[PDB]
């Protein structure tokens, strides 16, 4: 047992490792979206940079879980980072839709981890999730939903002018 | 009943008073460690100052509980501050080991208070503990554990050169 | 065919994708080393931060290949990022030895890519590798070799005092 | 023989003169595009200025070859600068398409010169091309391709509103 370990359940330690992997997976998906929008035959650079920024954000989320694991006396265990679901992302609307679903998947995993922490009576882990993850997640989901509403308003996927306008005025 | 009192259980009020006393006890133990490392036949001044700083931190923790008690309409009840367990602390490793155990004792009391607050459905007290105590406690425990690992690496208790090096490069 | 594509062989495009994956793999290995040295029972924070910085450097190398691929009209194709070879890294010497071998593996892949680019008469790709990768790689290999020499001098793996001194004066 | 001349093949000297002429030709084509978009019945001033800037860039490329020729002890030999292929450029999409093809023509000539320099074992000329020409060429081709993708997205040539929007938000 680690000398620092106190009130930290094995199940929570394992779930933190799985959560870490999911954050890395989300980062990698966003990296893929960046590369797609940077293609010469897609060429929506502000959209590309939005996804690149999100990729970095998700990596930071993962690193914060590594730090957390060690602070509690748990042990970081890494697994493969699976490649993203798609190799190409269609257009701004399809990508934003995929991002919304990804964000909700990550959110569900965070909420499940919070429930586990609650069941194991771990208020430190609860606080960590509430203070560092859950609100940023709600904010991100709201921003992406707002974007989707606007992309539909702008006539996506068919309206190329609408897609151009979004890239130039929303991101 | 205090005019401000709302959703504050008698059991929680009493437990806050006991927690206050424990913080003062921890402060006093750290004061003792400061005085020991300041001895001419011990003479590890950076180590002494580390413990002096922790003594002040613990006193601040106690004062914050006094303020909390009054904010909720509870009444501060003081008891004797018991003298520390030891009069002399051996060396840097023994002292850090004692500090780790003290920090875990304080942490357990905070977690027990959080459980009581949860049982009495007191979210304000839960928030207070999570926002002002529980994370600082985890951070402090991690720092002391890290120190112990390094002190063992440096050959404590036997290696006096190792002890000197720690005082000059870690604190 | 991409409208921008000129003098860019399919073999080079594929090799750039494989190189990208290797950079990500190297990043992930360094992330693992960071987490290990951040453990409470390892606790060499300057060493941890060295590896964390290298993890970020390798990610930047990967992103630069993504940008390169698109600039030439190639298409980014991502694969799984394999987890690192080890879950724990022994000590500073073992980790630095693993880092040296990793850096040489990455260097060999860069040199192989340069040879392919030479065979396909692609001076732009040659220039990119020479200007952005090959010298940084030689510099990094030299720095790590220098560290290993010093760690051996300091009596690693047995000499814990030597390991402490390295963390406090070399990184 | 020039007193400075060393490892400079007659074939490379002649090819540098031809390359110089091509840069001047490219400059002149861009000047024509500037004048077209400045017409009162075309009136896309940001597009005009983009081409004017490129005209100046190409002239600078030519001047750098003159300087290069003298540095190696070769002799600058000038030929007529042929007028551009067209007197009018249709619209933003047609012009960008012509610019892409022009840039690829210039790029091919640079790559051919690099191959000649390689065959004649002239690393100074290789370095000059790689360091001063080849990457700027790839960057320019990528930018123009990105523009074409966006112009098509915006409904060019038919969509006049799309053309206006491009002029006001992309250049
Ligand atoms: Cl535990
Ligand atoms: Cl507990
Ligand atoms: Cl457990
Ligand atoms: Cl696990
Ligand atoms: Cl009450
Ligand atoms: Cl209530
Ligand atoms: Cl009560
Ligand atoms: Cl009481
Ligand atoms: Cl090609
Ligand atoms: Cl070619
Ligand atoms: Cl090919
Ligand atoms: Cl591939
Ligand atoms: Cl010569
Ligand atoms: Cl020679
Ligand atoms: Cl000759
Ligand atoms: Cl000539
Ligand atoms: Fe995340
Ligand atoms: Fe996210
Ligand atoms: Fe305290
Ligand atoms: Fe404390
Ligand atoms: Fe790298
Ligand atoms: Fe590297
Ligand atoms: Fe040029
Ligand atoms: Fe050009
Ligand atoms: Mg376990
Ligand atoms: Mg998973
Ligand atoms: Mg798979
Ligand atoms: Mg918050
Ligand atoms: Mg009472
Ligand atoms: Mg007590
Ligand atoms: Mg007594
Ligand atoms: Mg709560
Ligand atoms: Mg907090
Ligand atoms: Mg291919
Ligand atoms: Mg590979
Ligand atoms: Mg495997
Ligand atoms: Mg070069
Ligand atoms: Mg260089
Ligand atoms: Mg001649
Ligand atoms: Mg010509
Ligand atoms: Mg003619
Ligand atoms: Mg360059």
Question: Within a 10 A sphere around the Cβ of A3, how many other Cβ atoms?
Answer: 19
With CA atoms as reference, report the closest residue to C1 among D140, A40, D96: A40
D chain contacts of residue A45, beta-carbon cutoff 8 Å = 146
Q: Report the C-alpha gap between B162 and C27 in whole angstroms.
A: 34
Distances (CA, A) of D60 to C31, C81, D28: 46, 45, 12
Mutation target vs A (from D153, D156, D170; most A CBs, 10 A cutoff):
D153
| CA dihedral angle for residue B93, residue B94, residue B97, residue B98, rounded to 10 degrees | -150
Pairwise CA distance, residues A10 & D118, whole Å: 63
- Tokens 């939005």, residue? A50
Residue C7, phi-psi category: left (phi > 0), alpha (psi -120 to 50), beta (remainder): left
Domains annotated for chain D, with CATH where assigned, are 1-171 (1.20.1260.10)
For residue A79, list chain C residues with Cβ-Cβ distance below 8 A. Answer: 83
**CA–CA separation, A27 and A33 (whole Å):** 10
8 Å CB contact of C161 and B154? yes
- Give the bridge partners for A81, in sequence order: C81
Q: How far apart are CA B90 and CA B95, in angstroms?
A: 7
Helix (H, G, I), strand (E, B) or coil at C81: strand
Task: For tokens 């707002």, name the residue.
Answer: A146
Q: Is C106 helix (H, G, I), strand (E, B) or coil?
A: helix
Facing residue for B142 by CB, picked from A4, A121, A128: A4
Say if residues C123 and D134 touch (Cβ distance below 8 Å). Answer: yes
In 3D, which of B55, B35, B31 has the Cα closest to residue B45? B35
| Closest C-alpha among B159, B152, B154, B156 to residue B169 | B154
Rounded-to-10 torsion of CA D99, D92, C70, A147: 170
Structure tokens at B69: 């008690």
Residue of B60, B123, C49, C43 whose CA lies nearest to A4: C43
Q: Are D43 and D53 in contact (CB under 8 A)?
A: no
For residue B154 the two structure tokens come to 């440096």
- Chain C residues with CB under 8 Å of a chain A CB are 2-4, 24, 28, 31-32, 34-36, 38-41, 52, 59, 63, 66-67, 69-70, 73, 75-84, 87
The answer for residues whose C-beta is within 8 angstroms of residue A107's C-beta and 6 or more apart is A134, A137, A138, A141
Q: Resolution reached, in Å?
A: 1.5
| Coil/strand/helix, residue D101 | helix
Using CA atoms, how far residue C37 sits from A70, C33, C46, in Å, is 10, 6, 9
Dist. CA D47–CA B143, nearest whole Å: 61
**CA–CA dist C23, C63 (Å, integer):** 9
Token pair 């915006």 in the structure block, residue: D154
In angstroms, the CA A50 to CA A92 distance is 11
Burial level of D92, CB count in 10 A (0-12/13-18/19+)? buried
Experimental technique used? Answer: X-ray
Given an 8 Å threshold on Cβ–Cβ distance, is A127 in contact with B148?
no
Any idea which ligand is nearest the CA of B113?
Answer: 2
Buried-exposed string B59-89: b where 16+ CB fall within 10 A, e elsewhere: bebbeebbebbeebebeeeeeeeeebeeeeb
Decide: A72 and A26 in contact? Cβ < 8 Å. no
Q: Tell me which chain C residue has its CA closest to the CA of residue B143.
A: C40
Interatomic CA distance for residues A11 and A22, integer angstroms: 17
Distance CA D19, CA B141 (A): 70
Q: Residue C81 phi/psi, 5° resolution?
A: -95, 110
What is the distance, to the nearest Å, from the Cα of residue C82 to the centroid of all Cα atoms in its chain? 14
d(CA A169, CA C90) in angstroms, rounded, equals 52
Q: Which two tokens stand for residue A69?
A: 């694991």
Cis peptide before A7 (omega within 30 of 0): no
Q: What is the 3-state secondary structure (H, E, C) of chain B?
A: CCCCCCCCCHHHHHHHHHHHHHHHHHHHHHHHHHHHHCCCCCCCHHHHHHHHHHHHHHHHHHHHHHHHHHHHCCCCCCCCCCCCCCCCCCCHHHHHHHHHHHHHHHHHHHHHHHHHHHHCCCHHHHHHHHHHHHHHHHHHHHHHHHHHHHHHHCCCCCCHHHHHHHHHHCC
**What CA–CA distances, in Å, run from C100 to C43, C143, C145, C165, D82?**
22, 9, 7, 21, 57
- Which residues on chain D place their C-beta less than 8 Å from a C-beta of chain C? 100, 104, 107-108, 111, 114-115, 118, 126, 129-131, 134-135, 138-139, 141-142, 145, 148
State the DSSP code for C39: S
- Residue corresponding to tokens 């999570």: B130
The CA distance from C86 to C31, in Å, is 12
Q: How far apart are CA C27 and CA B37, in angstroms?
A: 44
Q: Burial of B137 by CB count in 10 Å (0-12 exposed, 13-18 middle, 19+ buried)?
A: buried
Spell out the SS3 assignment of A124-140.
HHHHHHHHHHHHHHHHH
B76-82 long-range contacts, Cβ below 8 Å, gap at least 24?
B76/B17, B76/B20, B77/B14, B77/B17, B78/B17, B78/B20, B78/B21, B79/B17, B79/B21, B81/B21, B81/B24, B81/B25, B81/B28, B82/B25, B82/B28
Contact (Cβ atoms closer than 8 angstroms) between residue A70 and residue C38: yes
Cβ contact A2–B145 (<8 Å):
yes
Per DSSP, the three-state class of A81 is strand
């Amino acid at each position: 047992v680690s000398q620092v370990r106190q009130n930290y359940h094995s199940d929570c330690e394992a779930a933190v490792n799985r959560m870490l992997n999911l954050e890395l997976y989300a980062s990698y998906t966003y990296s893929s979206m960046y590369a797609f929008f940077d293609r010469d035959d897609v060429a929506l650079h502000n959209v590309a940079e939005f996804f690149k920024e999100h990729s970095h954000e998700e990596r930071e989320h993962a690193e914060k879980f590594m730090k957390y694991q060690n602070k509690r006396g748990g042990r970081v265990v890494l697994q493969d980072i699976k490649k993203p679901e798609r190799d190409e992302w269609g257009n701004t609307l399809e990508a934003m839709q995929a991002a919304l679903q990804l964000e909700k998947t990550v959110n569900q995993a965070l909420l499940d981890l919070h429930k586990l922490a609650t069941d194991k009576v771990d208020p430190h882990l609860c606080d960590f999730l509430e203070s560092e993850y859950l609100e940023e997640q709600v904010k991100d989901i709201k921003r992406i939903g707002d974007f989707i509403t606007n992309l539909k308003r702008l006539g996506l996927p068919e309206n190329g002018m609408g897609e151009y306008l979004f890239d130039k005025h929303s991101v």
